[PDB]
Design a protein around this ligand. Sequence first.
Ligand SMILES: CCCCCCCCCCCCCC(=O)O
Ligand SMILES: Nc1cc2ccccc2cn1
Length: 130
Amino acid sequence: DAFVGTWKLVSSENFDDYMKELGVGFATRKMGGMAKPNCIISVNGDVITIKTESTLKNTEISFILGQEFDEVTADDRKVKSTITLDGGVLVQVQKWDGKSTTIKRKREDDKLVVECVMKGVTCTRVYERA
Ligand SMILES: CCCCCCCCCCCCCC(=O)O
Ligand SMILES: Nc1cc2ccccc2cn1
């Protein structure tokens, strides 16, 4: 849709603070902070696939909107995730150990804008088409 494509990270704000709030350790934050991943988003009927590829870590999720699934995150959290579409925004929530984080993906002009929130921390990541 608006989301389908191969996207390359071009900017990131507050990602270290966001990772710290998730409980990610220093060595992993160091690797994560200067990664510039690609994000490849595809859709095949009810099923959306989001692949994130980087030099030191690949991940992939496939889901149906509104159907909770188990996810192992890039930082090795075991979470229950639910993704819905709200006013053209893909809203992902991850829940684990009584905690939650939201990752909102929106299309704005030319860009894919990803807002990640944990507690008081808001991180914004922008991707452009590859
Ligand atoms: C092994 C390096 C792992 C890097 C740490 C990743 C922490 C998980 C937060 C991922 C948020 C996704 C936001 C995005 O798609 O740009
Ligand atoms: N697979 C994967 C790799 C990442 C590398 C850096 C930052 C975030 C990331 C998210 N997912």
